[PDB]
Design an enzyme around this catalytic site. Structure first.
Site, PDB file in Angstrom:
ATOM      1  N   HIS A  65       9.724   5.809  -1.429  1.00  0.00           N
ATOM      2  CA  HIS A  65      10.179   4.424  -1.315  1.00  0.00           C
ATOM      3  C   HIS A  65       9.796   3.642  -2.563  1.00  0.00           C
ATOM      4  O   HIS A  65       8.602   3.459  -2.841  1.00  0.00           O
ATOM      5  CB  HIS A  65       9.544   3.762  -0.087  1.00  0.00           C
ATOM      6  CG  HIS A  65      10.080   4.295   1.194  1.00  0.00           C
ATOM      7  ND1 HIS A  65       9.447   4.149   2.415  1.00  0.00           N
ATOM      8  CD2 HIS A  65      11.210   5.002   1.429  1.00  0.00           C
ATOM      9  CE1 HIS A  65      10.182   4.741   3.343  1.00  0.00           C
ATOM     10  NE2 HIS A  65      11.261   5.254   2.772  1.00  0.00           N
ATOM     11  N   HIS A  95      -3.029   4.308   4.489  1.00  0.00           N
ATOM     12  CA  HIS A  95      -1.767   4.636   5.151  1.00  0.00           C
ATOM     13  C   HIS A  95      -0.903   5.564   4.294  1.00  0.00           C
ATOM     14  O   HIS A  95      -0.194   6.421   4.816  1.00  0.00           O
ATOM     15  CB  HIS A  95      -0.974   3.366   5.491  1.00  0.00           C
ATOM     16  CG  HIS A  95      -1.760   2.343   6.249  1.00  0.00           C
ATOM     17  ND1 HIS A  95      -2.190   2.540   7.544  1.00  0.00           N
ATOM     18  CD2 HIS A  95      -2.173   1.103   5.900  1.00  0.00           C
ATOM     19  CE1 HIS A  95      -2.848   1.470   7.955  1.00  0.00           C
ATOM     20  NE2 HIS A  95      -2.853   0.584   6.975  1.00  0.00           N
ATOM     21  N   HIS A  98       5.700   4.431  -3.097  1.00  0.00           N
ATOM     22  CA  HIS A  98       4.824   5.249  -2.280  1.00  0.00           C
ATOM     23  C   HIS A  98       5.705   6.272  -1.571  1.00  0.00           C
ATOM     24  O   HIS A  98       6.940   6.231  -1.666  1.00  0.00           O
ATOM     25  CB  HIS A  98       4.083   4.399  -1.246  1.00  0.00           C
ATOM     26  CG  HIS A  98       5.010   3.709  -0.300  1.00  0.00           C
ATOM     27  ND1 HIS A  98       5.549   2.470  -0.562  1.00  0.00           N
ATOM     28  CD2 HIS A  98       5.566   4.125   0.864  1.00  0.00           C
ATOM     29  CE1 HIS A  98       6.374   2.137   0.418  1.00  0.00           C
ATOM     30  NE2 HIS A  98       6.407   3.128   1.291  1.00  0.00           N
ATOM     31  N   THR A 124       9.051  -0.215   7.273  1.00  0.00           N
ATOM     32  CA  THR A 124       8.836   0.850   8.251  1.00  0.00           C
ATOM     33  C   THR A 124       7.385   0.955   8.717  1.00  0.00           C
ATOM     34  O   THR A 124       7.063   1.826   9.521  1.00  0.00           O
ATOM     35  CB  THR A 124       9.246   2.212   7.698  1.00  0.00           C
ATOM     36  OG1 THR A 124       8.356   2.569   6.635  1.00  0.00           O
ATOM     37  CG2 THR A 124      10.694   2.213   7.195  1.00  0.00           C
ATOM     38  N   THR A 125       6.523   0.076   8.215  1.00  0.00           N
ATOM     39  CA  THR A 125       5.157  -0.050   8.721  1.00  0.00           C
ATOM     40  C   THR A 125       4.948  -1.495   9.126  1.00  0.00           C
ATOM     41  O   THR A 125       5.660  -2.385   8.659  1.00  0.00           O
ATOM     42  CB  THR A 125       4.070   0.289   7.666  1.00  0.00           C
ATOM     43  OG1 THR A 125       3.966  -0.777   6.712  1.00  0.00           O
ATOM     44  CG2 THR A 125       4.352   1.603   6.964  1.00  0.00           C
TER      45      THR A 125
HETATM   46  N1  S2O Z   1       7.624   1.762   3.983  1.00  0.00           N
HETATM   47  S1  S2O Z   1       8.322   0.468   3.367  1.00  0.00           S
HETATM   48  O1  S2O Z   1       8.841   0.809   2.075  1.00  0.00           O
HETATM   49  O2  S2O Z   1       9.239  -0.053   4.341  1.00  0.00           O
HETATM   50  C1  S2O Z   1       7.078  -0.764   3.112  1.00  0.00           C
HETATM   51  C2  S2O Z   1       7.061  -1.488   1.930  1.00  0.00           C
HETATM   52  C3  S2O Z   1       6.161  -2.529   1.780  1.00  0.00           C
HETATM   53  C4  S2O Z   1       5.274  -2.861   2.793  1.00  0.00           C
HETATM   54  C5  S2O Z   1       4.303  -4.006   2.622  1.00  0.00           C
HETATM   55  C6  S2O Z   1       2.869  -3.519   2.653  1.00  0.00           C
HETATM   56  O3  S2O Z   1       2.530  -2.909   1.426  1.00  0.00           O
HETATM   57  C7  S2O Z   1       5.305  -2.122   3.966  1.00  0.00           C
HETATM   58  C8  S2O Z   1       6.197  -1.078   4.135  1.00  0.00           C
HETATM   59 ZN    ZN Z   2       7.619   3.360   2.900  1.00  0.00          ZN
END
Ligand code: S2O
Ligand code: ZN
Ligand code: S2O
Ligand code: S2O
Ligand code: S2O
EC number: 4.2.1.1
Length: 257
Positions: A116, A61, A91, A195-196
């Protein structure tokens, strides 16, 4: 099985993750005129001097740079936060073209990418417990625009060749995440979600006002990654962003006048 394609992307997520249509989903558009300065916000404290990076992973992803979070080595405090939040990973999300890629938008403006830095509230003991709490996580979001190169990003760029496909990882010790920050820590903040998928509503979002600049060459290398695993048909890892979601019953606060 969720992703960012026509057949598994953000429009489909709600079928397996019904909270996708919830009351505090992220990202959102930050209307700068409607956001209000909040004098009650404490100074933000980013304390990353003892950060211990370990590994970089292509998870199909995005790619995550992972940290040792067994102690308070790299923490975020202050701002809207009560207590101490420990850095676990960072990431990015990015586009196929420079005019898109960010998840948050600012007065509808999309940036080329968004960083993030993910932290969990230490009062909950572990990340898994933190994502069962309304104040379990804090994500520091930083916009990327294309201009001059970001020297502190180059080590990340250069390791990407070794994690091209889903499931690949590489050693990534001794990386200093402080090199990814802009000069100013002015920010907007609001309560939101991952956000995922699983889209859990556990996040205090802190989105920096000042973007960092990265070079065209740096972001081009992000776009050479693959969503797919080794041996599978190549699907370039691009446009791994969720669009802005309804603000609903939320106010975005600004740390600055
Ligand atoms: N894109 S985010 O930072 O909201 C995000 C952080 C942490 C996770 C958990 C899966 O690694 C999913 C999304
Ligand atoms: Zn993110
Ligand atoms: N709801 S979802 O995005 O996890 C999902 C989308 C599409 C499929 C079929 C491929 C399976 C799951
Ligand atoms: N791959 S990750 O960033 O979700 C992750 C980072 C750190 C630890 C510990 C576990 C998972
Ligand atoms: N949606 S957009 O990225 O084309 C866009 C960029 C800039 C602005 C002005 C703020 C508005 C929209």
């Amino acid at each position: 099985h969720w992703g960012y394609g026509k057949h598994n992307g953000p429009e489909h997520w709600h079928k397996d993750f019904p909270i996708a249509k919830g009351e505090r989903q992220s990202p959102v558009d930050i209307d700068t005129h409607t956001a209000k300065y909040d004098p009650s916000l404490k100074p933000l404290s980013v304390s990353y001097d003892q950060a211990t990076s370990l590994r970089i992973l292509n998870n199909g992803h995005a790619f995550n740079v992972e940290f040792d979070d067994s102690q308070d080595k790299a923490v975020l405090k202050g701002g809207p936060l009560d207590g101490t939040y420990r850095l676990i990973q960072f990431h990015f999300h990015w586009g196929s073209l420079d005019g898109q890629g960010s998840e948050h938008t600012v007065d509808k403006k999309k940036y080329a990418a968004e960083l993030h830095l993910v932290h969990w509230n230490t009062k909950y003991g572990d990340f898994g417990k933190a994502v069962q709490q309304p104040d379990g996580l804090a994500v520091l979001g930083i916009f990327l625009k294309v201009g001059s190169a970001k020297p502190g990003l180059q080590k990340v760029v250069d390791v990407l060749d070794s994690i091209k496909t889903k499931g690949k990882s590489a050693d990534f010790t001794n990386f200093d995440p402080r090199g990814l920050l802009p000069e100013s820590l002015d920010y907007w903040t609001y309560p939101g979600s991952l956000t995922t998928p699983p889209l859990l509503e556990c996040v205090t979002w802190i989105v920096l006002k000042e973007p960092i600049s990265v070079s065209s060459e740096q972001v081009l290398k992000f776009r050479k990654l693959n969503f797919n695993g080794e041996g599978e048909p190549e699907e370039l890892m691009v446009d791994n962003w969720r669009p802005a979601q309804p603000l609903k019953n939320r106010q975005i606060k600004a740390s600055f006048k």
